[PDB]
Amino acid sequence: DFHIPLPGRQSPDHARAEAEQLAWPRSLGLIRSDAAAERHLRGGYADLASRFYPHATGADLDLGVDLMSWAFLFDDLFDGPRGENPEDTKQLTDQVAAALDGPLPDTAPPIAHGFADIWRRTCEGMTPAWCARSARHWRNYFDGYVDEAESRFWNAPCDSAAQYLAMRRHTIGVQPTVDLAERAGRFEVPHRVFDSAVMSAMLQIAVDVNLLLNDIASLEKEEARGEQNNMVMILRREHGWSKSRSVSHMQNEVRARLEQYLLLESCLPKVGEIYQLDTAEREALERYRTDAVRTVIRGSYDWHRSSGRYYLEELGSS
Numbered sequence: 001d002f003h004i005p006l007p008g009r010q011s012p013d014h015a016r017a018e019a020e021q022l023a024w025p026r027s028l029g030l031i032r033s034d035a036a037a038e039r040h041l042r043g044g045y046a047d048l049a050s051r052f053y054p055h056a057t058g059a060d061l062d063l064g065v066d067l068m069s070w071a072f073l074f075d076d077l078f079d080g081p082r083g084e085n086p087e088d089t090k091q092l093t094d095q096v097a098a099a100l101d102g103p104l105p106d107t108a109p110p111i112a113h114g115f116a117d118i119w120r121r122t123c124e125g126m127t128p129a130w131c132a133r134s135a136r137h138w139r140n141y142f143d144g145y146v147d148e149a150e151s152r153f154w155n156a157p158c159d160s161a162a163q164y165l166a167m168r169r170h171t172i173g174v175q176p177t178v179d180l181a182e183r184a185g186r187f188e189v190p191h192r193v194f195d196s197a198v199m200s201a202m203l204q205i206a207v208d209v210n211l212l213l214n215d216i217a218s219l220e221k222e223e224a225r226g227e228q229n230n231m232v233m234i235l236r237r238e239h240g241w242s243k244s245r246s247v248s249h250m251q252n253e254v255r256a257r258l259e260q261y262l263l264l265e266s267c268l269p270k271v272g273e274i275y276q277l278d279t280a281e282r283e284a285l286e287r288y289r290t291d292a293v294r295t296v297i298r299g300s301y302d303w304h305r306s307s308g309r310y311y312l313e314e315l316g317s318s
């Protein structure tokens, strides 16, 4: 339990989105057995999308559903030996990230064709400058998986919280998730305001809160697997604390960050005057605050407590 002073929201079209969530990944070759389908439904991935994107319905919401489907199918391809070899991790991430640049060869693994279909749908109808900034966010995410594989290979665990966050902030995938809230909402935050120091601090709070929530929710699955790059394990190594002290420390950190997040929300009216936002930009920035940044913070908190997540080698083979 944590202090998330934000209203819980869920798309009114969530029942349909959960009922139809399997048709897209099955048609892409991402779910190939019936047991794989049930394993997927147990993740609650359409549920998570409907809470990340409460403002989306219909096809817009289905794009968010497919993003969560692909994202967790993708992340599963690295829990095994591939996530241990940075050469093989890079080999796969480069075939996925290639879709950001052009058409994939038909020999690409299905996980890459899945990403290509999502990225094609994310960009259509957005400004080219928005597509380029989002493609950069994806490349940061893929490169982060190669850094995590480098840490496991050379058996160099993250010795500090600082060194962990510099790596986990990219692999958590929050920024590509927030980017899709703009696409699913059919709006764009003023690009000069996205780059502002105030917005970056708010975005960084949303990332930190998410990875802290995830490191606590999946501590058992990572303790039973000897993983050393988890915030509760790193705090015990960095500060010599117990498990009960590090966990309560992480509650205080998500506590302090969400109060600082409120402080920054109150600065946005002044931030808009600084960048001379017209009324339309003022509204798009308001939508970004409530339908993209707030939703990625609150939506993750509700879903980490309800997700069942707390044989796929075919998807990464040419």
Ligand SMILES: C/C(=C\CC/C(C)=C/COP(=O)(O)OP(=O)(O)O)CCC=C(CF)CF
Binding pocket: 068, 071, 072, 075, 171, 172, 173, 174, 176, 177, 210, 211, 214, 218, 221, 300, 309
């Ligand atoms: C791109 C997205 C998800 C991809 C899957 C990712 C990055 C999952 C990151 O969590 P992991 O520690 O790698 O494994 P887990 O499933 O939690 O045991 C959006 C979901 C946002 C999250 C924020 F925390 C997922 F936890």
Ligand SMILES: [Mg+2]
Binding pocket: 075, 076, 079
């Ligand atoms: Mg994982």
Ligand SMILES: [Mg+2]
Binding pocket: 075, 078, 171
């Ligand atoms: Mg991972």
Ligand SMILES: [Mg+2]
Binding pocket: 214, 215, 218, 219, 222
């Ligand atoms: Mg985890």
